Amino acid sequence: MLSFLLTLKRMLRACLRAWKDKEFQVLFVLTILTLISGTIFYSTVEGLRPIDALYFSVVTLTTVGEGNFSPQTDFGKIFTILYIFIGIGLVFGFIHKLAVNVQ
Amino acid sequence: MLSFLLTLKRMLRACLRAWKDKEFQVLFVLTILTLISGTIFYSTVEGLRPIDALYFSVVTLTTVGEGNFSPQTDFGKIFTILYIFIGIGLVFGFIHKLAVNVQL
Amino acid sequence: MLSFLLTLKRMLRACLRAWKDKEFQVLFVLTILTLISGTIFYSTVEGLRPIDALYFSVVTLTTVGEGNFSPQTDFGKIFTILYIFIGIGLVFGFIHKLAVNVQ
Amino acid sequence: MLSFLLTLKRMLRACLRAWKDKEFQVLFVLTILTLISGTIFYSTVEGLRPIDALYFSVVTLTTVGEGNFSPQTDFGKIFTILYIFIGIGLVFGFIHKLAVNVQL
Ligand SMILES: [Ca+2]
Ligand SMILES: [Ca+2]
Ligand code: NA
Ligand code: NA
Ligand code: NA
């Protein structure tokens, strides 16, 4: 259905149009930064291969959760707790940004 | 209790009246497309039984999370990290939509 | 701080004022119903003690997730998938309800 | 890149300017109160080391979820089911707030 594609593309444009908005860019960078930080921390303190440090940071920052790994060190547990709250702040950031992009 | 049914019925009507929006429809199709790729990917690369690839795909794309399985291959891991953000993109699309339908 | 308590109570009133709204009531009942259904299904098909069937239904319906149990039977896995999507619809229901309660 | 910093700074100002709302403050305090009760409850009833009770409390109240531990006692299980809904109540409160701050 052509109606289908036209709608999809319209949406894809409204999407990319947002990837131009400065505030969206900031939020995006902050989460990429947060992901890098997490990849580093868990790689160092919990000693995971970088790929597994990133993976854990992702499933954790997004509240999906990891089914097997849990922070072993006390430093990791404390960091992860703060890490999670950073993620919540980020999402509220994005959410809020959408509530504004309506008017 | 009659108000319960009349309201419930008025709501179950909106949930369908909204199942008519071309933008919602797209989001939905995209979600099914995503769920199917995940199923294919996880059954192939991680060699999971099909229904378990869909299951993992579902609980992962919805942030519920799987309590026993975690991608074993570095390939699955990368895909999953990407699969998750797609899922977040989709939920934001849905929410953006409500916001729009609401403020209109 | 009295300012503190006054605010808290104001909020608690705006909360209970919602537990009167019919649509909120419907949504509430539906999730209680969904929770009961889940408690029953998992108790039967996955054969868990009712308390563990409820628990799993809760952590699952809310995307928190269970760290040890995963559906064993094919019927359970299919049901859980639908169960999750019901939960997402419910939350969108509540979310949407809040977006309306602003105007 | 200057716009990045000026915007970032304008935003980091709102996140603080909003950290001044009496209703947000309350939500925050309530969250800390909840996190502390959870820590006390889980360390006592499930006999978890304090920092692990807080950790479980945190990942549970935020729906992230814990991958290894699950309450063992029927008491913990009930509390957790309740702890979760409180958490959902809190996140809705926060969101309701944004909605209000936004449409004003
Ligand atoms: Ca989770
Ligand atoms: Ca596990
Ligand atoms: Na989990
Ligand atoms: Na979640
Ligand atoms: Na969530």
d(CA C91, CA D87): 14
Q: Ligand 1 center to residue A83 CA distance, Å?
A: 15
Calculate how close chain C gets to D11, using CA atoms only, in Å.
23
d(CA A1, CA A42): 47
Residue pair B98/C99 in contact by the 8 Å Cβ criterion: yes
Q: Ligand 5 center to residue A83 CA distance, Å?
A: 15
Residue list, CB under 5 A from ion ligand 4:
A 63; B 63; C 63; D 63
d(CA D37, CA B73): 40
Please work out, in degrees rounded to the nearest 5, the angle formed at the alpha carbon of residue C86 by the alpha carbons of C82 and C90. 170
CB-nearest partner of D51 from A74, A88, A93: A74
d(CA B94, CA A98): 11
Q: How many CB atoms lie within 10 A of CB A100?
A: 15
* Domains defined along chain C, listed by start: 1-103 (1.10.287.70)
Task: Say yes or no for a CB contact (<8 Å) between B23 and A11.
Answer: yes
d(CA B97, CA A14): 12
Please work out, in degrees rounded to the nearest 5, the angle formed at the alpha carbon of residue B59 by the alpha carbons of D77 and B8. 75
Among D55, A65, B102, B94, residue whose Cα is nearest residue C89 = B94
d(CA A29, CA A24): 9
Residues of D with CB under 8 A from a CB of A: 3-4, 7-8, 11, 15, 51-52, 54-55, 58-59, 62-69, 94-95, 98-99, 102-103
Residues of C with CB under 8 A from a CB of D: 3-4, 7-8, 11, 51-52, 54-55, 58-59, 62-69, 94-95, 98-99, 101-103
* C60 contacts on D by Cβ (under 8 Å): none
- End-to-end Cα spacing for chain D: 31
* C63 contacts on A by Cβ (under 8 Å): 63
* Backbone conformation region of residue B63, classed left if phi is above 0, alpha if psi is from -120 to 50, else beta: left
d(CA C51, CA D81): 10
Task: Say yes or no for a CB contact (<8 Å) between C65 and B67.
Answer: yes
d(CA D26, CA B54): 41
CA atoms within 13 A of residue C84's CA, in its CB half-sphere? 25
Tokens at A10, concatenated? 């319209």
Residue pair D40/D53 in contact by the 8 Å Cβ criterion: yes
d(CA D88, CA D29): 16
Cβ-based burial of B1 (10 A; exposed 0-12, middle 13-18, buried ≥19)? exposed
Among C34, C16, C8, residue whose Cα is nearest residue C93 = C34
Please work out, in degrees rounded to the nearest 5, the angle formed at the alpha carbon of residue C80 by the alpha carbons of C42 and B67. 90
d(CA A27, CA A93): 7
CA D50 from chain center: how many Å?
Answer: 17
d(CA B17, CA A100): 25
Which of C11, C28, C69 has the highest number of chain D CBs within 10 A, making it the mutation to test binding with D? C11
* Backbone conformation region of residue B48, classed left if phi is above 0, alpha if psi is from -120 to 50, else beta: beta
d(CA B68, CA A57): 18
Question: For this experimental structure, what is the resolution in angstroms?
Answer: 2.6
Task: Say yes or no for a CB contact (<8 Å) between B67 and D67.
Answer: yes
- End-to-end Cα spacing for chain A: 31
CB-nearest partner of B64 from C26, C63, C78: C63
Q: Which amino acid is at C98?
A: L
* Backbone conformation region of residue D13, classed left if phi is above 0, alpha if psi is from -120 to 50, else beta: alpha
Among C89, B59, A95, A88, residue whose Cα is nearest residue B51 = B59
Minimal-distance CA residue of chain C relative to A60: C64
Question: For D1-104, where are the alpha helices, taking DSSP H only?
Answer: 2-17, 22-44, 50-61, 74-103
* Backbone conformation region of residue B73, classed left if phi is above 0, alpha if psi is from -120 to 50, else beta: beta
Tokens at C103, concatenated? 């105007």
- Taking CB atoms within 8 Å and a gap of at least 24, the contacts of A19-24 are A21/A97, A22/D3, A22/D4, A22/D7, A23/A97, A23/D7, A23/D11, A24/A94, A24/A97
Size of interface B-D (CB pairs under 8 A): 8
Task: Say yes or no for a CB contact (<8 Å) between A58 and B81.
Answer: yes
SS (H, E, C) A2-41: HHHHHHHHHHHHHHHCHHHCHHHHHHHHHHHHHHHHHHHH
Task: Say yes or no for a CB contact (<8 Å) between B95 and A94.
Answer: no
Please work out, in degrees rounded to the nearest 5, the angle formed at the alpha carbon of residue A8 by the alpha carbons of A5 and A9. 85
List the subunits that have 3+ CB pairs under 8 angstroms with C: A, B, D
Q: Which amino acid is at B97?
A: K
